[PDB]
Amino acid sequence: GSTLVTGSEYETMLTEIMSMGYTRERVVAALRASGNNPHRAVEYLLTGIPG
């Protein structure tokens, strides 16, 4: 069933997005802003957070 992401899955998501050329600090902030939705996190990194 649908469960919350695990810590290890979060870390792989974080490092995967970092491989696009973003610092760890920025990706962590984007993932927080997106609620661990990688699609929104990447959108925020590409074109900016809401506002």
From Swiss-Prot:
Subcellular location(s) of the protein: Nucleus
Disulfide bonds: none
Residue ranges constituting the UBA domain according to the UniProt record: 8-48
UniProt family annotation: Belongs to the RAD23 family.
Subunit: Interacts with XPC; the interaction is suggesting the existence of a functional equivalent variant XPC complex. Interacts with PSMD4 and PSMC5. Interacts with ATXN3. Interacts with UBQLN2. (Microbial infection) Interacts with HIV-1 Vpr.
Domain notes: The ubiquitin-like domain mediates interaction with ATXN3.
Its biological purpose: Multiubiquitin chain receptor involved in modulation of proteasomal degradation. Binds to 'Lys-48'-linked polyubiquitin chains in a length-dependent manner and with a lower affinity to 'Lys-63'-linked polyubiquitin chains. Proposed to be capable to bind simultaneously to the 26S proteasome and to polyubiquitinated substrates and to deliver ubiquitinated proteins to the proteasome. Involved in nucleotide excision repair and is thought to be functional equivalent for RAD23B in global genome nucleotide excision repair (GG-NER) by association with XPC. In vitro, the XPC:RAD23A dimer has NER activity. Can stabilize XPC.
Name this polypeptide is given: UV excision repair protein RAD23 homolog A
Organism: Homo sapiens
Section of the entire sequence shown: 155 to 204 of 363
